[PDB]
Amino acid sequence: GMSHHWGYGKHNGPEHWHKDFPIAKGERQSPVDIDTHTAKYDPSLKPLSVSYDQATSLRILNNGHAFNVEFDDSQDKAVLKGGPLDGTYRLIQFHFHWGSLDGQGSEHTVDKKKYAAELHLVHWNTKYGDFGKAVQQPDGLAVLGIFLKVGSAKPGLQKVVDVLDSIKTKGKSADFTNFDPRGLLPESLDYWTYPGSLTTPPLLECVTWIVLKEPISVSSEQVLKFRKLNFNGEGEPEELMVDNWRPAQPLKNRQIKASFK
Ligand SMILES: Cc1cc(=O)oc2cc(CS(N)(=O)=O)ccc12
Ligand SMILES: [Zn+2]
């Protein structure tokens, strides 16, 4: 990726990605709009199992696109299973996509509604040994998506908000141990699920998407901090890190299933 130049600006944004990553116009791209009236309840979907009690966060990184909270996935600690998944998926990192204003920022939409932001907890299928091998498989990753709306503060998110000052620019990282991701979950685990892809290049079609129906609420102050981050590196002209979301892509030959009636 040392020669990647994609981003979210007018000249290298989502509409340009297909040039270096043809799969951008593929058959199972993400995100997508979730038409609530067309999604069908699937009584055969197992309950979702989110086991994060043993999760071990290690570091937070500004990668020039978003910020990644990374976990130690060298062992089966934090795992996602059940739901539409077969097997065990290990949590490797989480990040967000957000907007310049509260009216936009999420990648998936619900009946065309855009949320202020969207949290993605990324997990890889342990049957493939490592993340690199997993992304080359149609069932290699499981990403849990959670919508954020602006209202009351999310206590569990403040530790993340407070460390952002230390990783303002691209390439900066900071120790970030003992962060509990259970603090970012809504009360209900009802979800929609469909086969899709990574939403940033390489846009690989290796993801089983699980998007929770219940959004979490974060405060204006919390999201304002996200918007103070920079896409640029230290010493460069400031480009605020905002609107780092890819818009909804064609659903094509796919069905979105609901875990609830
Ligand atoms: C670890 C990793 C490798 C890769 O090639 O692409 C990624 C894309 C995302 C963004 S998202 N929105 O698709 O989760 C997150 C993590 C990765
Ligand atoms: Zn993402």
Numbering used by the authors: 0 to 125, 127 to 261
Q: What did the authors write?
A:
As generally observed for other hCAIs containing the sulfonamide moiety, in both adducts the inhibitor binds to the enzyme active site coordinating the catalytic zinc ion through the ionized sulfonamide NH- group and forming further hydrogen bond interactions with Thr199 residue. Interestingly, even if the coumarin moiety is a well-known chemotype for CA inhibition, in the case of compounds 1 and 2, it does not adopt its typical suicide inhibition mechanism, due to the predominant effect of the sulfonamide moiety as zinc binding group (ZBG). Interestingly, even if compounds 1 and 2 differ only by two atoms (two fluorine atoms instead of two hydrogens), their arrangement in the enzyme active site is significantly different. Interestingly, from inhibition data analysis it emerged that, although these two molecules possess a very similar chemical structure (they only differ for the substitution of the two aliphatic hydrogen atoms with two fluorine atoms), they showed a significant difference (more than three times) in the inhibition activity against the hCA II isoform. Previously reported inhibition studies showed that compound 1 was an hCA II inhibitor three times more potent than compound 2, suggesting that its binding conformation was energetically favoured with respect to that adopted by the fluorine derivative.
Carbonic anhydrases (CAs; EC 4.2.1.1) are widespread metalloenzymes which catalyze the reversible hydration of carbon dioxide (CO2 + H2O ⇆ HCO3− +H+). The enzyme active site is positioned in a deep and large cavity, with the catalytic zinc ion placed on its bottom coordinated by three conserved histidine residues (His94, His96 and His119) and a water molecule/hydroxide ion which acts as nucleophile in the reversible hydration reaction of CO2 to bicarbonate ion. Here we report the crystallographic structures of hCA II in complex with two aliphatic sulfonamides incorporating coumarin rings, which showed a good inhibition and selectivity for this isoform.
